[PDB]
């Protein structure tokens, strides 16, 4: 096994492509930007390419995966609601055959540390779990949806799911949300909106945009372990890859166990797109 640098020109492109494949594979949540390659290691096989094992540092972008954008098509999210963390991925490459493939992955993500946000900006809307225990977040998304249905006479829409949420209390209870919808289907667009009550005046706002491999993502509580192996075998696993080829010739790949981070080079981790200690992973 050859440990590789995180600033290497092949490793950088492979990580971007692998992350784009993960975003395309994902059925829910948001397109992830590659903050940097975090570790990289390679198994070499002569003329028929190599197998790469990558660890990444990553950030959540402004686009839901149902929009099907690449992460270069998407902006940096605001600091007070950034989701950040790390991915492990296994990826075959053979440029002479023009064959590139995400074999498997797992990712651990978190909302940005609530203490470190408070310290940076005390009034910033602190991010929260989107599950149905938060009645008032559901009230926020349904109020913004009701406002959108009252504004848009051509069609009417129903709440599918709430995808992101936060709140602030300065002028009063002030909730900010992103959520998915369908007409009255696969969810047809991503809504963004808010609900605020003062003791006297009340406000609602809304804007909305209309639009296998083994692996996983988890969203954990805030302060990055990642479980991943296609095999336990020290010999590695002769996994079929014949179906990758333009004529599906009989081809099988020896997947070794995931190369451990104790084999990191001094060229890892790489240079970050966003080095801020709030959202740069450990």
């Amino acid at each position: 096994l050859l440990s590789r640098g995180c600033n290497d020109s092949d490793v950088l492109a492979v990580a971007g492509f692998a992350l784009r494949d993960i975003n395309k594979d994902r059925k829910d949540g948001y397109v992830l930007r590659l903050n940097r390659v975090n570790d990289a290691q390679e198994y070499r096989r002569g003329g028929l390419g190599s197998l790469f094992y990558l660890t990444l540092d990553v950030l959540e972008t402004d686009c839901h995966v149902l929009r099907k954008k690449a992460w270069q098509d998407c902006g940096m999210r605001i600091f007070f609601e950034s989701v950040y963390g790390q991915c492990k991925a296994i990826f075959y490459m053979n440029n002479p055959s023009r064959v590139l493939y995400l074999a498997a992955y797992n990712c651990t993500l978190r909302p940005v540390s609530k203490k470190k946000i408070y310290m940076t900006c005390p009034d910033c809307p602190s991010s929260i779990p989107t599950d149905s225990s938060n009645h008032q977040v559901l009230e926020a998304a349904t109020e913004s949806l009701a406002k959108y249905n009252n504004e848009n006479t051509s069609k009417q829409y129903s709440l599918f799911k709430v995808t992101r949420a936060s709140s602030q209390w300065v002028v009063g209870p002030s909730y900010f949300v992103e959520y998915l919808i369908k007409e009255s289907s696969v969810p047809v667009g991503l809504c963004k909106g808010s609900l605020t009550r003062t003791h006297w005046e009340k406000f609602v706002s809304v804007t909305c945009d209309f639009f296998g491999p083994r692996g996983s993502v988890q969203y954990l509580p805030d302060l990055f372990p990642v479980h991943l192996d296609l095999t336990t075998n020290p010999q590695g696993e002769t996994l079929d890859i014949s179906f990758l080829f333009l004529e599906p010739m009989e081809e099988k790949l020896v997947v070794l166990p995931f190369p451990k981070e104790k084999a990191r080079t001094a060229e890892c981790p790489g240079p970050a797109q966003n080095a801020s200690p709030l959202v740069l992973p450990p």
Partner: protein
């Protein structure tokens, strides 16, 4: 409650951008808050001209500021209803390196936090900073402070206060949204070495026998009495015979 590190201090005038996503009501409320700063302190504002740090005010989600001068220049948000002058003033005090008053190191001497009554996921908004991070500016904890949170902030139940003053009178006072408090100005002035307000040109109440350095003419026939408020109905306006 001021950020100790002197690098975090602005150098006046703070250059500002108003983003065009701001309503007119929010742009005008910002410029009205600036007039209050200029009127009550040496804090000053100027339009942007390419400076290294500046505030951009925004109609983003919520109403919030990074604390102190970020030397790259920084967002402030003013969401709906934060058009109120005092909420702009509060966010600009965050921009001027000030944390919430209940986030003072000594805050537990002055306010109860009812952690059990805070919404789950929001207890950290009642964190308190150590004295290496923040100065007291040799000032007392101020319940009248604009930087203080009201009793019903981040609460589970609308009837139940998250935060209460240990002197119980001040429950009716904490988190006022009138203006800067006198101690918020005293702090702001200690933070920026302000001795003279930009717009208070003069004031006078005649309490002193030099009559605020007024003079009486001689071209006129006669003089105004400097009158002692002592006669039966004839009280001053400053003290009303109190």
């Amino acid at each position: 409650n001021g950020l100790r590190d002197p690098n975090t201090r602005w150098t006046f005038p703070i250059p500002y951008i108003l983003a065009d996503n701001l309503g007119l009501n929010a742009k005008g409320a910002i410029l009205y808050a600036f007039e209050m700063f200029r009127l009550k302190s040496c804090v000053d504002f100027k339009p942007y001209e390419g400076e290294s740090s500046y505030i951009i005010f925004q109609q983003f989600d919520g109403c919030w500021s990074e604390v102190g001068d970020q030397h790259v220049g920084q967002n402030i948000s003013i969401g709906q209803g934060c058009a109120y002058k005092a909420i702009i003033e509060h966010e600009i005090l965050h921009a001027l390196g000030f944390y919430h008053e209940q986030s003072r190191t000594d805050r537990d001497d002055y306010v109860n936090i009812w952690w059990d009554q805070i919404l789950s996921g929001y207890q950290h908004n009642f964190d308190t900073y150590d004295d290496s991070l923040i100065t007291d500016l040799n000032t007392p904890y101020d319940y009248e402070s604009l930087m203080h949170y009201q009793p019903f902030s981040f609460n589970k139940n609308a009837s139940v206060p998250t935060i209460t003053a240990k002197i119980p009178e001040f429950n009716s006072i904490i988190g006022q949204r009138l203006d800067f408090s006198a101690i918020d100005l005293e702090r702001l002035n200690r933070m920026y070495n302000c001795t003279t307000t930009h717009t208070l040109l003069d004031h006078c109440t005649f309490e002193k026998a030099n009559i605020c350095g007024m003079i009486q003419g001689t071209r006129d026939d006669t003089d105004w009495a400097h009158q002692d408020s002592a006669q039966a109905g004839e009280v001053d306006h400053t003290l009303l015979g109190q």
